Curated annotation (Swiss-Prot), chain A:
Gene: rpsO
Disulfide bonds: none
UniProt keyword list: Ribonucleoprotein, Ribosomal protein, RNA-binding, rRNA-binding
Subunit structure: Part of the 30S ribosomal subunit. Forms a bridge to the 50S subunit in the 70S ribosome, contacting the 23S rRNA.
PROSITE patterns named among the record's database cross-references: RIBOSOMAL_S15
Record carries keyword rRNA-binding: yes
Summary of the function given for this chain in its UniProt record: One of the primary rRNA binding proteins, it binds directly to 16S rRNA where it helps nucleate assembly of the platform of the 30S subunit by binding and bridging several RNA helices of the 16S rRNA. Forms an intersubunit bridge (bridge B4) with the 23S rRNA of the 50S subunit in the ribosome.
GO terms under cellular component: cytosolic small ribosomal subunit
Name of this protein: Small ribosomal subunit protein uS15
From Swiss-Prot, chain B:
GO cellular component: ribonucleoprotein complex; ribosome
Compositionally skewed regions (Basic residues) per UniProt: 43-56
Domain of life: Bacteria
Keyword field contains Ribosomal protein: yes
Protein name per its UniProtKB record: Small ribosomal subunit protein bS21
Record key words, sorted: Ribonucleoprotein, Ribosomal protein
A biological process from GO: translation
Basic and acidic residues: compositionally biased ranges: 57-65
Family named by the database record: Belongs to the bacterial ribosomal protein bS21 family.
Organism: Escherichia coli O9:H4 (strain HS)
A single GO molecular function term of this UniProt record: structural constituent of ribosome
Annotated spans, Disordered: 40-65
From Swiss-Prot, chain E:
InterPro entries referenced in this protein's UniProt entry, alphabetically: Ribosomal_bS18 (IPR001648), Ribosomal_bS18_CS (IPR018275), Ribosomal_bS18_sf (IPR036870)
The protein, known as: Small ribosomal subunit protein bS18
Species annotation: Escherichia coli O45:K1 (strain S88 / ExPEC)
UniProt GO MF annotations: small ribosomal subunit rRNA binding; structural constituent of ribosome
The organism's taxonomic lineage, starting at the top: Bacteria, Pseudomonadati, Pseudomonadota, Gammaproteobacteria, Enterobacterales
HAMAP family membership: Ribosomal_bS18
Origin: domain of life: Bacteria
UniProtKB/Swiss-Prot annotation, chain F:
Gene3D superfamilies recorded: 2.30.30.30, Nucleic acid-binding proteins, Ribosomal protein L2, domain 3
CC per GO annotation: cytosol; large ribosomal subunit
Family: Belongs to the universal ribosomal protein uL2 family.
Gene for this chain: rplB
Name of the protein this chain belongs to: Large ribosomal subunit protein uL2
Matches recorded under SMART domains: Ribosomal_L2, Ribosomal_L2_C
Species classification: Bacteria, Pseudomonadati, Pseudomonadota, Gammaproteobacteria, Enterobacterales
Taxonomic source organism: Escherichia coli O45:K1 (strain S88 / ExPEC)
A Pfam family reported for this protein in Swiss-Prot or TrEMBL: Ribosomal_L2_C
Length: 88, 65, 100, 116, 65, 271
RNA sequence: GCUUGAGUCUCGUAGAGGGGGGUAGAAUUCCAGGUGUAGCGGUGAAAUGCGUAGAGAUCUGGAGGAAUACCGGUGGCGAAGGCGGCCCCCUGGACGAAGACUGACGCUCAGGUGCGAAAGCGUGGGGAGCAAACAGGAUUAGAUACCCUGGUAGUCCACGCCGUAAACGAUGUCGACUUGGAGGUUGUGCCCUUGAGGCGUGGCUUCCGGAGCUAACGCGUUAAGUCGACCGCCUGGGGAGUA
RNA sequence: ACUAUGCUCACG
């Protein structure tokens, strides 16, 4: 469920400091980090539908933060997506 | 289950069996307990238990006996 | 990385090899970072029921920290070996001591 | 001829029958009797006394072997067994120990359907 | 009586069988909580340890082996 | 793997191809293939002894090693190839000292995997061993019936033998027929299952596809005249005869096993 | 802007949450082998069935499949369907503790899309037990049933379909608010652990009851009370959830 | 053990 070193690495990069860990910029990166880690898990398995429910929670949770971020500030919205590799 | 009873005694006395198994093998796994029926017959045996226990507190009525 | 608690049992005649067996399994794990926390050979203990039509197995508790690559290589050496009568590998919750 | 010291009286007590079978120490049959073999047929075959008389009929017909003392190994439920062991004393034996071999399956095979 | 002790807490372990054999009946079956006290949390740990001990042939599965 | 073909023509409607992408797209390794001329069913005396064989695509023989001796020499699998001579696909194994040879491709094998053969080795799919060294209750293939020979049993796509027991010098094997056959423990067996298990799900789809596999049409006895086949004649779809071969021997339940030299080795016949 | 809703991280706690792989013991059937002598089996009572070719019973050694006794509870987890031997692998959520951060990011949702017991269906495995269909013996006025002896699809597995159930608390989701008692379960505080305790306060949960509501039955801080947001649905019975 | 049925309408 994402190691503490993996979260702390992303937290102390996108945000201001290690203290700041709840920004829309940070939150979207932690979801994206976990969603990509789960693609290996759903490459095989496949029938694990209960875990997919948690994944599809993360996916929809991400899009509501991104859609919030776009309406709030278009500048940092476009800069965040280029770094993470979203919008396909 | 394995009951020797020393030497002078004999007279069965094997409640060790009767207060352990017998009913478990027999009147349960003799004929099929249709998955749901246990869930039904337990929950009524469970509801009948607390029906008596809740009444046992309110059993102290007038009586006059 | 992860802590484990390996408890395997060995056939009576091959109990003389167990001093050697432990040295081989230690060398596998101790090379890859994680140390062995406990060494306790239980000895030729009686079985509750016969396994493989015999009594008296030679029990060995290791208890060790290791990565997942080494522990599964050790798990495979138990199945491809007629000397070892059964084994099991428990999870983490830190290291321990004593108890028998 | 043989002349065994001790044996094992296996009792297979089902609801319908009570099959007594006296064997030796190493599970090797010496003789037997049944509630159906005693006479007692139909409703009479499923009773405590019809098992008693079957054990009395199994008590003799193993006198050639000359068993002094034996172990009981009851099985199934049945109306017998709490009556059949009484018969082994009254006949002429010494019961060393009484045991159960009632085969308890640890939820294994689906039993037959309930009857109406 | 209840759990381990006043300042016990601890965790019910499978290796020791002296304290563990008190929590199984003479046949080999597990004794329930309503006979031997015990909080539900430790009765689950106990049950799990009895099964782990059974696997290693430390405790027996039954007395017809 | 099993791809169903779109119905752009009748006889392309029911076609179901076994496309293996991991197979080789190029010419095979020339030193290990000689020519293989076709019999058309006929023998020494030029007479059709086996009916319904004739024609098909010209196909060269790969010199596949079944015995698999060359001991104590690890060998890297270079590439998985097509074999027209066989149900199962083959693997071009490059031995560390610089030989190449073909082997039957097991299930879990790929271009890059390393394989060893001999007495010691490791218990892993592809590694040939004597069946004495192999664990009881394990899946093998390419099994020898006699020590030192090639490999008779379990060489067809998806096929495998399971080792049931080991009585001293003899090993009891449960074959894919269901027959439990006793073989010598010194005999060798390549570990795992034979690959290309999708082979069975291929469906040809046209009459032509059987022709280019070297099969010729089977004519039914009932169609023929009395002179030709025991089933024969009748004025419009008659029979009234117990099923039989063209040579009168009863088909449809009639044991023709009569070896009697090898009946000692068969534990239980198949069912 | 703000921070109370909502979300993030931090350290843990419980759990048949899931998916993949192993392995254990009891038992059933069967397989060959030893013993052994007439029955066994079954039933309301019988018979078909099985047995002198030596069954049943008993023991020895295998093989295979499926399901996990006891723990086990008005216990737990899951959105629902549902989920119980033990062990590792990957993995989703829940809750608690005190902070720090974001700064309304929220709630509902027509269409859309996913998951969805059992039975079915398709291709390929497996097949002990059980068992629709089916057969025979009973029962009966008849018995295409109930009972008995046999018994194939199926139940198991892998992968696709199906998309329904009294899929039920017959109770849509989210939020706020309004007397109590006895418990179960899992947290975390304060105190002497001074001895299986003393005292709070969060989750989830079962039972009884107050006002209030209800046609009544009952519901009743987990509302069917008092209100708000949005959705779904209803408009006599048959015809018909049919054409 | 199992064990069927009761032709129509009629109490302001
Ligand atoms: K389904
Ligand atoms: Mg997450
Ligand atoms: Mg999380
Ligand atoms: Mg910020
Ligand atoms: Mg919106
Ligand atoms: Mg149920
Ligand atoms: Mg010539
Ligand atoms: Mg020639
Ligand atoms: Mg010639
Ligand atoms: Mg032909
Ligand atoms: Mg030609
Ligand atoms: Mg050829
Ligand atoms: Mg050919
Ligand atoms: Mg061929
Ligand atoms: Mg020799
Ligand atoms: Mg032909
Ligand atoms: Mg044909
Ligand atoms: Mg023909
Ligand atoms: Mg003609
Ligand atoms: Mg001719
Ligand atoms: Mg002719
Ligand atoms: Mg004609
Ligand atoms: Mg005709
Ligand atoms: Mg005719
Ligand atoms: Mg003829
Ligand atoms: Mg003829
Ligand atoms: Mg003829
Ligand atoms: Mg046949
Ligand atoms: Mg604040
Ligand atoms: Mg929340
Ligand atoms: Mg704690
Ligand atoms: Mg769990
Ligand atoms: Mg877990
Ligand atoms: Mg789980
Ligand atoms: Mg699981
Ligand atoms: Mg699984
Ligand atoms: Mg077993
Ligand atoms: Mg068995
Ligand atoms: Mg024979
Ligand atoms: Mg025989
Ligand atoms: Mg008769
Ligand atoms: Mg007859
Ligand atoms: Mg006869
Ligand atoms: Mg016969
Ligand atoms: Mg005979
Ligand atoms: Mg027999
Ligand atoms: Mg028998
Ligand atoms: Mg056996
Ligand atoms: Mg087995
Ligand atoms: Mg819950
Ligand atoms: Mg719910
Ligand atoms: Mg795995
Ligand atoms: Mg949730
Ligand atoms: Mg989360
Ligand atoms: Mg808090
Ligand atoms: Mg703002
Ligand atoms: Mg601020
Ligand atoms: Mg909706
Ligand atoms: Mg909708
Ligand atoms: Mg679906
Ligand atoms: Mg499903
Ligand atoms: Mg589905
Ligand atoms: Mg199903
Ligand atoms: Mg099917
Ligand atoms: Mg079909
Ligand atoms: Mg087929
Ligand atoms: Mg069958
Ligand atoms: Mg049946
Ligand atoms: Mg039936
Ligand atoms: Mg019928
Ligand atoms: Mg008949
Ligand atoms: Mg009938
Ligand atoms: Mg009739
Ligand atoms: Mg049957
Ligand atoms: Mg299963
Ligand atoms: Mg599976
Ligand atoms: Mg699977
Ligand atoms: Mg669908
Ligand atoms: Mg729907
Ligand atoms: Mg519906
Ligand atoms: Mg339901
Ligand atoms: Mg319900
Ligand atoms: Mg309720
Ligand atoms: Mg409804
Ligand atoms: Mg919703
Ligand atoms: Mg909360
Ligand atoms: Mg009231
Ligand atoms: Mg109202
Ligand atoms: Mg009222
Ligand atoms: Mg309510
Ligand atoms: Mg409130
Ligand atoms: Mg309140
Ligand atoms: Mg509350
Ligand atoms: Mg509410
Ligand atoms: Mg309400
Ligand atoms: Mg109402
Ligand atoms: Mg309407
Ligand atoms: Mg209407
Ligand atoms: Mg109408
Ligand atoms: Mg319709
Ligand atoms: Mg009539
Ligand atoms: Mg009438
Ligand atoms: Mg009338």
């Amino acid at each position: 469920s994402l190691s503490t070193e993996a979260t702390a690495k992303i937290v102390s990069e996108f945000g201001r400091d290690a203290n700041d860990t709840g920004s829309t910029e940070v939150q979207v990166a932690l979801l994206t980090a976990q969603i990509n880690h789960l693609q290996g898990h759903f490459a095989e398995h496949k029938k694990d539908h209960h875990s997919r429910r948690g994944l599809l929670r993360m996916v929809s949770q991400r899009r509501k933060l991104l859609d919030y971020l776009k309406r709030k500030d278009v500048a940092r919205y476009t800069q965040l997506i280029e770094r993470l590799g979203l919008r396909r | 289950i394995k009951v020797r009873e020393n030497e002078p005694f004999d007279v069965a006395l094997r409640r060790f069996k009767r207060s352990c198994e017998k009913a478990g093998v027999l009147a349960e796994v003799r004929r099929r307990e249709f998955y749901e029926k246990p869930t039904t017959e337990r929950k009524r045996a469970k509801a009948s238990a607390v029906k008596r226990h809740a009444k046992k507190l309110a059993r102290e009525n007038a009586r006059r006996t | 990385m992860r802590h484990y608690e390996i408890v395997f049992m060995v056939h009576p005649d091959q109990s003389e090899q167990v001093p050697g067996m432990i040295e081989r399994y230690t060398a596998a794990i101790t090379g890859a970072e994680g140390k062995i926390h406990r060494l306790e050979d239980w000895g030729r203990r009686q079985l509750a029921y016969p396994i493989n039509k015999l009594h008296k197995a030679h029990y060995v508790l290791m208890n060790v920290e290791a990565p997942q690559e080494v522990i599964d290589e050790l798990e495979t050496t138990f199945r491809f070996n007629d000397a070892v009568i059964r084994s099991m590998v428990m999870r983490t919750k830190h290291a321990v001591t004593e108890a028998s | 001829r043989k002349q065994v010291s001790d044996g094992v009286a296996h009792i297979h007590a089902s609801f319908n029958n009570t099959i007594v079978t006296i064997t030796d120490r190493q599970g090797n049959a010496l003789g037997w009797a049944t509630a159906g073999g005693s006479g007692f047929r139909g409703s009479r075959k499923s009773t405590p006394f019809a098992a008693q008389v079957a054990a009395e009929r199994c008590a003799d017909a193993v006198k050639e072997y000359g068993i002094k003392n034996l172990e009981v190994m009851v099985k199934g439920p049945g109306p017998g067994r709490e009556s059949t062991i009484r018969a082994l004393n009254a006949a002429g034996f010494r019961i060393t120990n009484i045991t159960d071999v009632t085969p308890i399956p640890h939820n294994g095979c689906r039993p037959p359907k309930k009857r109406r | 009586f209840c759990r381990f002790t006043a300042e016990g807490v601890q965790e019910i372990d499978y290796k020791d069988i002296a304290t563990l054999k008190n929590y199984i009946t003479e046949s080999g079956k597990i004794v329930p909580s309503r006979i031997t006290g015990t909080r539900a949390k430790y009765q689950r740990q106990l049950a799990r340890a009895i099964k782990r001990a059974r696997y290693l042939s430390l405790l027996p599965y039954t007395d017809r082996h | 793997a099993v791809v169903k073909c779109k119905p752009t023509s009748p006889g392309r409607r029911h076609v179901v191809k076994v496309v293996n992408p991991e197979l080789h797209k190029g010419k095979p390794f020339a030193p290990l293939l000689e020519k293989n001329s076709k019999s058309g069913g006929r023998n020494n005396n030029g007479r059709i002894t086996t009916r319904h064989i004739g024609g098909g695509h010209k196909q060269a023989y790969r010199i596949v090693d079944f015995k698999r001796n060359k001991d104590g020499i690890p060998a890297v699998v270079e590439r998985l190839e097509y074999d027209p001579n066989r149900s199962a696909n083959i693997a071009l194994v490059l031995y560390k000292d610089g030989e190449r040879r073909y082997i039957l491709a097991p299930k879990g094998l790929k271009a890059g995997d390393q394989i060893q053969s001999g007495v010691d080795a490791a218990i892993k799919p592809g590694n040939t061993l004597p069946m004495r060294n192999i664990p009881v209750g394990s899946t093998v293939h390419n099994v020898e019936m006699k020590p030192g020979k090639g490999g008779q049993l379990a060489r067809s796509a998806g096929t495998y033998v399971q080792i049931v027991a080991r009585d001293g010098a003899y090993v009891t094997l449960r074959l894919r027929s269901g027959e439990m056959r006793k073989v010598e423990a010194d005999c060798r067996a390549t570990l795992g299952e034979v690959g290309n298990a999708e082979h069975m799900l291929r469906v040809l789809g046209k009459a032509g596809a059987a022709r280019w596999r070297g099969v010729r049409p089977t004519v039914r006895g009932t169609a023929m005249n009395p002179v030709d086949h025991p089933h024969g004649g009748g004025e419009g779809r008659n029979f009234g005869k117990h099923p039989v071969t063209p040579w009168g021997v009863q088909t449809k339940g009639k044991k023709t096993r009569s070896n009697k030299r090898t009946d000692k080795f068969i534990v239980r016949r198949r069912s």
